[PDB]
């Protein structure tokens, strides 16, 4: 037969709105991009993705939160010589610091006053401001080491809630509040006026509603505070004399987030009216007169912009923005109006939420804390498990023959026997307290009974017991970004597995002797791994979009000519291939897929010859077929020797900025 | 049946006037629509019916005008795009052959009023 | 509708008096103006009902090509017994 294709649009797995973008390292234009730069994206359903902007923005890790959890602000902290530290507020009274290894909170510091509305990090990163609902600004001593947080000082109180914070330096702390005012406190310890609010400024109020100052930044090249409020106006204030220099009436509704570049020649700003405005001071006359101009204005987002940030280095100068529509947008910093931009896909499934089983023609898919199963026929939803004893979900696998499902999150996992009772299923928990106590990242089913478990604390069990696993050399990037030496992937069928950690290490393991035989042999982050039983091979693909294969018991000649005979589609690819499998009718052809395309490479053929992180910066160290007509893509797989399963996505009020009518 | 005979004759290569005659033979409304729904392309049925309705814009048969109005109802996404060199003057001379009835509908309705008045007063004065 | 039955009978019966009157149009101007403005727009609503009826029977015949299909097409469902076997806290309970 020819390939018959099930273009499924059943799964309505929808992410949530980006509420906070942050960059791990600050800008430093005249030095190279550090190998430890990570962008962090906190959504509104409570999960924190961490992306690396090397070679078109791959996604390294994801830290999910559970039911009724959100995340409103998040800040990085990297004292030079120590590990990265990631703090985040939710809609609650605590700050939550996460250890990047496990993907769990390692500290929930309850701030001692009210519900936190904003968070900011000191310059030199030893103190932390949390601005709370009862008008307080609380200082948290951060420099005690990673994990230990102390209370320092509650600054002088006020009535209205402080909605945004910024620091001048180690010295002063600026805060925009919900009464339309902008206070300036002094956090300079061992002064006479420590903690008391030195100044108050009032923005031009709205006529028929209350005004809220939503975004405040400090501009260090000049000595100003930029501030966006809920009238749309953007004001620049001289810090000394605490007074306005110039006001622009830029947006039509609120200005939720605004940011600046390194040398403060530009200020970018955005809000609910979904345009991004650029205010420039680049002319020598502008710099000697201290006069910003409203330079430009772009309409790129669909609904809102709730978060904006900027990075600028020797081989990277981009501002990143995201909002109520769930996608990310990258623009250039010094070439905003002129240059190009890239709207990311709303999901790039580096961690999958859908898998199928060929027997019973069935497919399982898990959104937040519920799984669902349907069969092909049309299609019919046969069962679902809205387990609400759970709070957060993570990865899942089904037994071949479709008997037992296992769902698993970083706190526990749970296994359910299934029996098809006709037009429905019957699902029963089968108790195992070892599974109920273990942390699981990946479960991948050696047999109908045996599974292999990768724990969040780097343990590899075999249940239904222990694989010896050698240690990795801890270099500076491994001590800086503390999840690089963590097992991302493991793929197995028939007693032979292979694990993969993102330092460029991909290690096989025989399930019998439980010995490594390492084949690290790599240069950067590994996107996907699939084992070919034909050729006795492992197939790794890295973030640079190269396909390597190696043998087992280094790379084959097919790899050796394929890598540099690779097609132009792969050489101009933008979305990384997150899934590989092999064809079912032929044991040697392999069939892979990214988030916007589907390809298939042939095992023997070779074809003839004749807005990124682009610098000389290193990685994290110091017949051929191609289609894209199923581009909003979530997951693909096979069922039998002729058909294919292509499950994708399909689609909210927004500020109407109308197209010209004719 | 005879609709299939007319379909095969009009689809083979030739006999278009005889094809419209065989269409006028059985001449169902439902089969008239079905013969438009079945065929995927026409051999300038619009051209031959254009010249027929141009040479007789006043015929008592409703067959070819019924066929033209159902062709224009069901296939006019493609009659404006099949051909535009002879078809342009075809629709031009068809439109100028048919506009005169729009010019003289008021006088015919006037004469209909005349005659209804005359016949009703003649029925009225009927000599007891 | 109802009253012009009266006006056609007045012309038919009194067909001599108001042909012997010297200024017919000047004496019943309001009838002439009313009928002129009623019958002046007849080509316009001719074009209107041609264009309207064309689309009307166009969707009528296209929907009569499949008019029996929407009588048993709706096979929709709801939160069935999978929800009862789904509630894992209620599965520990009952």
């Amino acid at each position: 037969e020819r390939m018959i294709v099930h273009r499924c649009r059943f799964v309505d797995f929808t992410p949530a709105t980006i509420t906070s973008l942050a960059f791990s390292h600050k800008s430093n234009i005249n030095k190279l991009t550090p190998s430890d730069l990570r962008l962090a994206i906190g959504r509104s359903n409570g999960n924190i993705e961490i992306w690396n902007p090397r070679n078109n923005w791959f996604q390294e890790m994801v830290i999910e939160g559970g039911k009724d959890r959100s995340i409103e602000g998040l800040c990085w902290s990297n004292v030079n010589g120590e590990s990265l530290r990631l703090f985040s507020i939710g809609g609650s009274t605590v700050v939550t610091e996460w250890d990047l290894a496990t993907g769990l909170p390692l500290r929930n510091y309850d701030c001692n006053s009210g519900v936190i509305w904003s968070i900011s990090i000191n310059d030199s990163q030893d103190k932390l401001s949390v601005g709370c609902d009862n008008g307080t600004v609380v200082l948290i001593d951060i420099s005690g080491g990673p994990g230990v947080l102390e209370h320092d000082t509650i600054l002088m109180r006020q009535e209205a809630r402080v909605l945004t914070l910024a620091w001048k330096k180690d010295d002063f702390v600026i805060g925009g509040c919900s009464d339309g005012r902008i206070r300036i406190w002094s956090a300079q310890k061992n002064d006479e006026n420590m903690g008391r609010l030195l100044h108050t400024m009032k923005v031009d109020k709205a006529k028929k509603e209350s005004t809220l100052v939503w975004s405040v930044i400090y501009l260090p090249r000049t000595d100003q505070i930029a501030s966006g409020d809920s009238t749309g106006s953007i004001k620049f204030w001289d810090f000394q004399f605490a007074t306005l220099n110039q006001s622009f009436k830029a947006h039509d509704a609120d200005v939720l987030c605004l940011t600046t570049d390194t040398d403060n020649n530009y200020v970018f700003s955005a809000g609910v009216d979904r345009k991004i405005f650029q205010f420039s001071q680049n002319t020598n006359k502008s710099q000697k007169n201290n006069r910003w101009v409203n330079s430009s204005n772009r309409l790129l987002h669909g609904n809102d912009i709730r978060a904006i940030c900027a990075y600028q280095s020797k081989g990277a100068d981009f501002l990143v923005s995201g909002g109520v529509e769930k996608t990310l947008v990258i623009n250039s910093l010094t070439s905003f109006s002129n240059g190009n931009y890239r709207k990311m896909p709303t999901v790039e499934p580096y961690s999958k939420n859908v898998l199928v089983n060929k027997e019973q023609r069935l497919v399982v898919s898990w959104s937040e804390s519920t799984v669902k199963i349907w069969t092909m026929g049309n299609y019919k939803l046969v069962c679902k498990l809205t387990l609400k004893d759970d709070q957060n979900i993570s990865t899942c696998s089904l037994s071949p023959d479709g008997q037992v499902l296992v769902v698993g999150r970083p706190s526990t996992t749970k296994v359910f026997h299934l029996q098809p009772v006709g037009n429905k299923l019957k699902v029963t928990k089968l108790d195992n307290d070892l599974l109920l106590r273990t942390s699981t990242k990946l479960v991948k089913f050696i047999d109908n009974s045996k599974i292999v478990i990768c724990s969040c604390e780097d343990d590899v069990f075999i249940v239904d017991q222990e694989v010896e696993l050698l240690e990795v050399t801890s270099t500076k990037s491994s001590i800086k970004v503390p999840y690089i030496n963590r097992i991302n992937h493991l793929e197995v069928d028939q007693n032979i597995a292979v694990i993969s950690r993102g330092c460029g290490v991909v290690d096989i393991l025989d399930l019998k002797a439980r010995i490594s035989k390492p084949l690290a042999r790599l240069n950067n982050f590994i996107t996907a791994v699939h084992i070919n039983t034909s050729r006795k091979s492992v197939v790794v693909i890295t973030a640079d979009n190269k396909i390597y294969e190696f043998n087992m018991n280094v790379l084959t000649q097919w790899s050796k000519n394929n890598t540099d005979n690779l097609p132009k589609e792969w050489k101009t690819l933008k979305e990384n291939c997150v899934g590989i499998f092999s064809d079912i009718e032929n044991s040697s052809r392999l069939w892979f897929w990214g988030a916007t395309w589907i390809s298939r490479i042939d095992f023997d053929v070779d074809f003839p010859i004749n807005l990124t992180i682009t610098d000389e910066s290193n990685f994290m160290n110091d017949h051929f077929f191609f289609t894209d007509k199923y581009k909003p893509l979530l997951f693909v797989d096979l069922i039998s020797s002729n058909e294919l399963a292509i499950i994708e996505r399909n689609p909210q009020k927004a500020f109407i900025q109308p197209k010209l009518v004719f | 049946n005879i609709l299939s005979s007319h379909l095969e004759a009009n689809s083979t290569e030739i006999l278009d006037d005889l094809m419209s005659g065989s269409w006028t033979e059985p001449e169902i409304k439902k089969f008239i629509l079905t013969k438009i729904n079945t065929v995927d392309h026409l051999s300038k049925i619009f051209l031959t019916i254009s010249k027929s309705i141009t040479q007789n814009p006043w015929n008592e048969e409703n067959l070819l005008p019924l066929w033209l109005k159902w062709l224009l109802t069901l296939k006019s996404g493609e009659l404006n795009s099949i051909k535009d060199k002879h078809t342009k003057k075809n629709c031009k001379h068809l439109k100028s052959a048919l506009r005169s009835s729009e010019e003289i509908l008021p006088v015919l309705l006037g004469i209909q009023g005349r005659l209804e008045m005359l016949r009703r007063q003649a029925k009225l004065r009927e000599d007891l | 509708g109802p009253l012009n039955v009266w006006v056609k009978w007045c012309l038919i019966i009194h067909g001599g008096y108001l042909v012997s009157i010297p200024n017919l149009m000047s004496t019943l101007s309001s009838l002439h103006s009313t009928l002129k403005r009623r019958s002046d727009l007849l080509p316009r609503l001719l074009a209107l009902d041609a264009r309207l009826d064309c689309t009307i029977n166009k969707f009528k015949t296209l929907n009569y090509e499949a008019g029996d299909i929407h009588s048993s097409e709706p096979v929709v469902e709801e939160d069935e017994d999978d929800v009862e076997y789904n509630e894992e806290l209620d599965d520990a309970g009952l």
């Binding site: 020819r2 390939m3 018959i4 294709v5 099930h6 273009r7 499924c8 649009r9 059943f10 049309n378 299609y379 077929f625 289609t627 399909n650 | 814009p57 006043w58 015929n59 008592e60 409703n62 005008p65 033209l68 109005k69 224009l72 629709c91 068809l94 439109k95 048919l98 506009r99 005169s100 009835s101 729009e102 003289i104 509908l105 015919l108 309705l109 209909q112 | 080509p43 001719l46 074009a47 041609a50 264009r51 064309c54």
Partner: peptide, 28 residues
């Protein structure tokens, strides 16, 4: 029948999406 022919001629004068699941094919 003249007003009928005239009405029809004048009519001639003034006369002058994605489902949730498909199944298709692609190249081998």
């Amino acid at each position: 029948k003249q007003v009928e022919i005239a009405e029809r001629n004048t009519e001639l004068w003034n006369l002058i999406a994605l489902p949730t699941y498909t199944m298709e094919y692609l190249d081998i």
